């Protein structure tokens, strides 16, 4: 696997060379953000339930249809599926956050995920939606947690953006 | 013109008891399984070399019982003839027969069976009496398919034989996470070569025979 | 790659479950050992040269047989490789410093190591060496954690050579 | 596995010793025979159906229980596998001879073979007398054949019985 | 598995109750100590390789028959597994001090050990001894390290000791 | 144990059927083989001693410096152990000449070889020198197919050793 | 054995899961029909020997050379034989009838037939011609369901020879 | 298809291994009985039809009902079969004496065997006799080793038909 | 598999005939050399380590590049890598030499390889020279041996050839 250190390891690598002092402040100054980077994962893992279960709701209240006999969504087997996987997915995300990048993201997750969704007939419009859907209620609970030092996690929460939307687009 | 010459004839001298090496092979009757010879489908593979991985898995896959004409399992190995499905495919449907299920399963208790299960789908005996639990709740969930296809599925069946190989005896040496018990369970799972796992004696099949290892204090150091 | 993020990572991966707070104690562990591991780094990146003259320099005290016509010590193509070979080693151990876990050297240097050398013939024996005569060096320029580290790796290869 | 040249071998290695000239001899006289030793191998594995279709006959007409109801050789089923077990001790006897040693007879087929014919409830005894049934027979072709050179076979047709018997003795 | 936390836990549940207080106090000093404990296996596993074969020369030194035509070490193969299987029991041993706990060395790697020794055959006396002179060579790493702190260790050198005994007397 | 006739046994043997005339015909060849093979083996049982003593001495004049204070070579049970293992290789190398296959080598010599000398720091390459100048003397007490089948098995170790 | 009720429970058993009606349904089934079987049996366990004399007889007319001496219909002993045999037939085809299922048929008779007859080389056809000839005869003491059911099962047996 | 050489190099390839002395001893076998072989399928291949036609006859001789009208020795185009199998037969013995290995045997005849003469009820016994009358003539075209090779794949035979 | 006499019975099967007295003396030929022929194979097995390793070290004094890192042979598992394929490449040659047919060679060992090779991003074009390097040195050996009765062993040195050669198209 990788993750952003192991990454510029191996970029290091292939030129041949010790790292650059350059990119050693790079690391420097990521592993500062550890603490901010820590909490923003443990945020999502902690409301993870919630967070689908919320946005499933608001998926279905908008695309009646998938609920409805002969749609995507019914019957309960179904369902259970579409649950399952917006979980995953959310589980990838949470780990790269965590990483540092997308790489684990894309090779376990996204890799093969839309032509799966094609094969069965399951509209990947649909999911990349459930997607956002996630998205924007994760980032809810990123934040404005509870009990944490006041600060700025801006330059988190738009990676986790970033994710968030990879895995939207390669789906889609 | 070298001279000197230190004797060495002490070293050559031999041990006060000594065994041939793969003594303790021929004791305990393992030689044969002991090193296990692995056997793998190729590809563009011969008509003779395919009926040699049938024979091979029939003899490890079922127990070593006899499988007579009537036995044989036609559409299974037809497909893999004309490479449709895998060895690892082959060893499923097999392991899902209206014949294992009526020798292993039907007489069995679901630790007899369980434990039967390790042996023919992977050759180690069950380590612990975690893994008999894990494998008594799945089935118990979701029933004997998905019991079966959880060995075969399985990472370390995967690892040591992942397709195109026949599963062997990996038991009777040491496997990397054995534990031991290994060593000592295999022992009680593997009969001769002139054994095998029947029920054909008395209709049930015995009873677990590793229940009360598995649940062995330490004897006091 | 083998690093405490990517395990805890692969483990909760494995059991299908997301990351707990059992995890991330762990990955906390990672970061803030970093600050001596990164300081390390930077004090081995600077010497390296340095330090590699001197180990294989070592290498030929030890072994005088091997600057001898006929030997593999002998002419310089070989003092070149010599020399590249021990950058390597190096360059590893810093990264692996960096990466915070073993990953960069098992993947690179200790995945093929013995067929790689019995294939050319190069004797373990000489590596270990050079290490051993670096890491005395090294056991100058630092101290405290930051020390203890490098030694961690350094041995590592040792571990994995012999 | 062994065989009469690897298993003086090993005599000699424990001993710690190059080979004795006189253990040589063996050796040396052994290879003499091979001709003699092949063509005893040849004539059982020629006549192989026969040897076993005959004893059958002879078993059956003397233990006529055997093929009664209740017996073990009924029905169909169990008198198959009595028909295959047969043959498998044949088919060893036959390896043991070429190989001029007991040991591969003894530990793939003998072993085990007592305590399972226990727990099958099948009768160790009438199997030994098969065994020997076979064994009469089997001597008959390879002490009686044509077309091959007229000598002395007896030395290599005694060491055929004892195999027989180590098989009639461990399985009774 | 287990482990001295885990374990403290265990107990407290059958009781039913909460952590004594007093309990609470084995575990906090655990802790401050933990750095030691750290050390301590770092130097182990930092000189694996050398115990190791230490302890080897020495074993057959001893025992000289071991290393004999017709002992257990001899041949190749023989000797390569009791250097793998002294390795092994090292492995779990260093396992055990980390945890702060027998049991892991106990159940994967002691349990059954010694029977499986006496079926090959293989001299129990002799793995014991093997056991021993490991500890002490290793003990010696422990004790004995540079770029340390300097401080007192004995706690842990003797629980160190312990493991390796508990090995030793289960084997034997 | 791998020879000729234990094969063919094991071959039949696995599919389930009787020794046929294609094994036979095998069997054969190792029989007819032999001849030559056993002259072979009473020519190296002879002078083996001779040939020891003149391969460890090679060893040395190969590589001097073991014979130095503080190496390998140096001291007299060094020395003894030296002798010795090359006693072996011989006498295993003898035996699987009679036994008409590799066999005895395999699960004497071979099996575990790289690990032990990995352990004990054993380096293959002095082995080899023992083996090949072996092969020079044998090449002079024998001659034709006797000698064609000495080289094979030496060469086999060799091959196995580097 | 294979009986509509064993197996109503092995696929019960293989899910995991009580008996609901699907399985119900389908023992009922066996139930309803057992009168008819149960009433076949009773018909050919009262004619039994009647029917195997036929049959036999039938036999020898179709291939009269089996009688000439030499041969194996020749001579009492095979005669007996002959007679037993047909005998278990029948006595299995009833089992099977009242057990409701092949499963008697398929144990007894079915499961090695194909070995046992080529190592004695009894020729399937002459079973069959017994069978048939039977069929004959029974296809005039029963009529409607009964017979059906009786038929079956002959059948089923005369596939298997064949 | 199953020769000495292709097993040698199975067993070998498998293993993952060069080949060895070990089975260079084999192949020496299969090339030095090749002389023999060869010179038994010239002597076959030379005489095949008269042996055919002798067979068929026999047959005849033996079984004299088959040649009667409704029967499968009747009428000509049966005869013509009849023929042709047994060429085939002796074909393919021809074929494994120069391959050396039964093979070619096992591949075209033996696998299927059974149950093709299952279904068009072609009794074995046939077969057999053809065979070894078959066996009979051969053994006068040939003496010693050729001979005894030609009876082995004729034996072979036999024993997969019975 | 396949070799000389089976496909020759193959190709006279399909005519449905007896082997033409013509094919009988290609394969009568084909025993008379058969001595040279097992000498061949001999030399290479015997000398196989070094061929490889001689053939490697040219490989890698001309492509210097391939150690360099972002080469292909670089880092050392690839180089591993590297040796044990074109030790198996060996390996097969031998085979097919002994066989005297291509067949085993084409369908185990090449079938599919470029396309791996390709795939991975391996060059082509270098794997090929490393085949040709090895070809060299093999004839080398097979064409100058010690004890041996001197005589002609072209013939087969040209199927050497043509063998490593099959090897080196299907590869680049
Ligand atoms: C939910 C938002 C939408 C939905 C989902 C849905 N999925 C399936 C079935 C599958 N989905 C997957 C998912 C994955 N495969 C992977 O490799 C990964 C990443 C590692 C994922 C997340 C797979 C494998 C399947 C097929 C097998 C299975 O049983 O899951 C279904 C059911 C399809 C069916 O016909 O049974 C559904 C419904 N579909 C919707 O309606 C939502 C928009
Ligand atoms: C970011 C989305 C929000 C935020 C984050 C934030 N966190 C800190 C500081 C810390 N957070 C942690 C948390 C952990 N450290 C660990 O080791 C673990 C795993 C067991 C966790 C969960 C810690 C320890 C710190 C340091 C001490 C502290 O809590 O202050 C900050 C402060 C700045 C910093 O980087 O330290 C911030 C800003 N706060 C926000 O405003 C966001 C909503
Ligand atoms: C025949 C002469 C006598 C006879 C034998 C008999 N055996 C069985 C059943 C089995 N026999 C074996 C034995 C072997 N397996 C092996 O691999 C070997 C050689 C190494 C042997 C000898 C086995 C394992 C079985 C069980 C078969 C299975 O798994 O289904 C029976 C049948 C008993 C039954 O009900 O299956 C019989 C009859 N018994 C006689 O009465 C004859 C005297
Ligand atoms: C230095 C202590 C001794 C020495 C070394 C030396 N090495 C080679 C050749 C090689 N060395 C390596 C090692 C590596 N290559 C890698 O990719 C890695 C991983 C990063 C390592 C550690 C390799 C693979 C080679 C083989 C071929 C190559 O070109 O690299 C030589 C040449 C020996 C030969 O047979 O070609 C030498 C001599 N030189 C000295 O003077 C010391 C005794
Ligand atoms: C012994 C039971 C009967 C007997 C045997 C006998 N055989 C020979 C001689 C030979 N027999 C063979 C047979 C083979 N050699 C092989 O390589 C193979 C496998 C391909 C076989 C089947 C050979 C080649 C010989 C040599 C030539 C010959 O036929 O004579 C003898 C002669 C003595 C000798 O030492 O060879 C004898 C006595 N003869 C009997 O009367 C016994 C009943
Ligand atoms: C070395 C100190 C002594 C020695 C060791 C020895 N062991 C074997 C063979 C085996 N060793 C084991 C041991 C283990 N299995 C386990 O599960 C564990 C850890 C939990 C161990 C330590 C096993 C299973 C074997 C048998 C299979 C195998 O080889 O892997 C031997 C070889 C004996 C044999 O005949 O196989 C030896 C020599 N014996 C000595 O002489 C030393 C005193
Ligand atoms: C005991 C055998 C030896 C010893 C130990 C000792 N260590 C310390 C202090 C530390 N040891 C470590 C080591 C680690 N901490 C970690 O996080 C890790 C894993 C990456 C390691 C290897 C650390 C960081 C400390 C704190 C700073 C320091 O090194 O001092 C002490 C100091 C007292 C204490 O209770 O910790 C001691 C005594 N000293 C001995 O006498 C032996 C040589
Ligand atoms: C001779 C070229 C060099 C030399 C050798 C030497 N060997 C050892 C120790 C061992 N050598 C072997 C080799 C074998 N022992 C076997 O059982 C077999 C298989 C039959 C072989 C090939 C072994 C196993 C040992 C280790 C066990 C032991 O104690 O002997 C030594 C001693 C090594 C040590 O560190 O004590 C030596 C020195 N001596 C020379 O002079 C040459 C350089
Ligand atoms: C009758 C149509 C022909 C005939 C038959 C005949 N059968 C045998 C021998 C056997 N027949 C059977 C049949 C069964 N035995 C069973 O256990 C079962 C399953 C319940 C069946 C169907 C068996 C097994 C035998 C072999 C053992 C035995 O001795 O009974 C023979 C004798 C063959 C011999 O070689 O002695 C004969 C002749 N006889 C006739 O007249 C018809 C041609
Ligand atoms: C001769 C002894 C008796 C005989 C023979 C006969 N045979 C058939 C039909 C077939 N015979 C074979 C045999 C082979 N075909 C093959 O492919 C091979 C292997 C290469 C063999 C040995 C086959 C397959 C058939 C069936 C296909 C066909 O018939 O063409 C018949 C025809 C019977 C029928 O059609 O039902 C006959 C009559 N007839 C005699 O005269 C002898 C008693
Ligand atoms: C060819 C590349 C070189 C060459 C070969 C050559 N060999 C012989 C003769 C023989 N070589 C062997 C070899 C074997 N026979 C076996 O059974 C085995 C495996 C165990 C081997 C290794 C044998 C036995 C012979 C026959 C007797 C002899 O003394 O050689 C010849 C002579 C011609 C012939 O075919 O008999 C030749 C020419 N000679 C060269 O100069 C080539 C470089």
Known sequence: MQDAFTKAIVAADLRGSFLSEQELNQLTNLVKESNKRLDAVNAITGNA????????????????DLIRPGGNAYPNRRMAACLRDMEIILRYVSYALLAGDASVLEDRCLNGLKETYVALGTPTRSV?????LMKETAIGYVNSPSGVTRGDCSALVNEAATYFDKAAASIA | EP?????????????????????????????????????????????????????????????????????????????????????????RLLAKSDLYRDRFFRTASNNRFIELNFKHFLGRAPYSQAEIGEHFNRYHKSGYDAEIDSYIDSDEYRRVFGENTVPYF??????????????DQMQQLFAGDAGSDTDRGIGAQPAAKLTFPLSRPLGVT | ?????????????????????????????????????????????????????????????????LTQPGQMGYGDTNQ??????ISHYLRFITYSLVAGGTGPLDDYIVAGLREVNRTFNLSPSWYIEALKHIKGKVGSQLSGQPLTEANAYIDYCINALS
Chains 1, 4, 5, 9 share one sequence.
């Open chain 1, 49 to 64: 339930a919630e967070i689908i279960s919320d946005a499933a709701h608001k998926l279905f209240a908008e695309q009646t």
């Open chain 3, 80 to 85: 070149a490789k010599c020399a590249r070979d």
């Open chain 2, 3 to 91: 001279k000197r010459v230190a004797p060495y004839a002490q070293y050559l001298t031999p041990a006060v008891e000594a065994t041939p090496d793969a003594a303790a092979q021929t004791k305990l009757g393992i030689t044969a399984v002991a090193p296990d010879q692995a056997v793998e489908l190729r590809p563009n593979f011969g008509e003779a070399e395919v009926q040699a991985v049938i024979r091979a898995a029939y003899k490890q896959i079922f127990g070593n019982t006899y499988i007579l004409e009537a036995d044989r399992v036609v559409i299974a190995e037809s497909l893999l003839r004309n490479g449709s499905i895998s060895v690892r495919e082959f060893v």
């Open chain 2, 170 to 183: 990996r038991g009777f040496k040491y496997q990397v996470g054995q534990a031991a018990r290994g060593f």
């Open chain 1, 128 to 132: 990349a939606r459930a997607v956002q």
């Open chain 3, 1 to 65: 790659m083998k690093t405490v993020i990517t395990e805890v990572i692969a483990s909760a991966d494995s059991q299908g479950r997301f990351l707990n707070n059992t995890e991330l104690q762990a990955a906390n562990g990672r970061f803030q050992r970093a600050t001596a591991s990164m300081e390390a780094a930077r004090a081995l990146t600077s010497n390296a040269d340095s330090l590699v003259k001197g180990a294989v320099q070592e290498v030929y005290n030890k072994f005088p047989y």
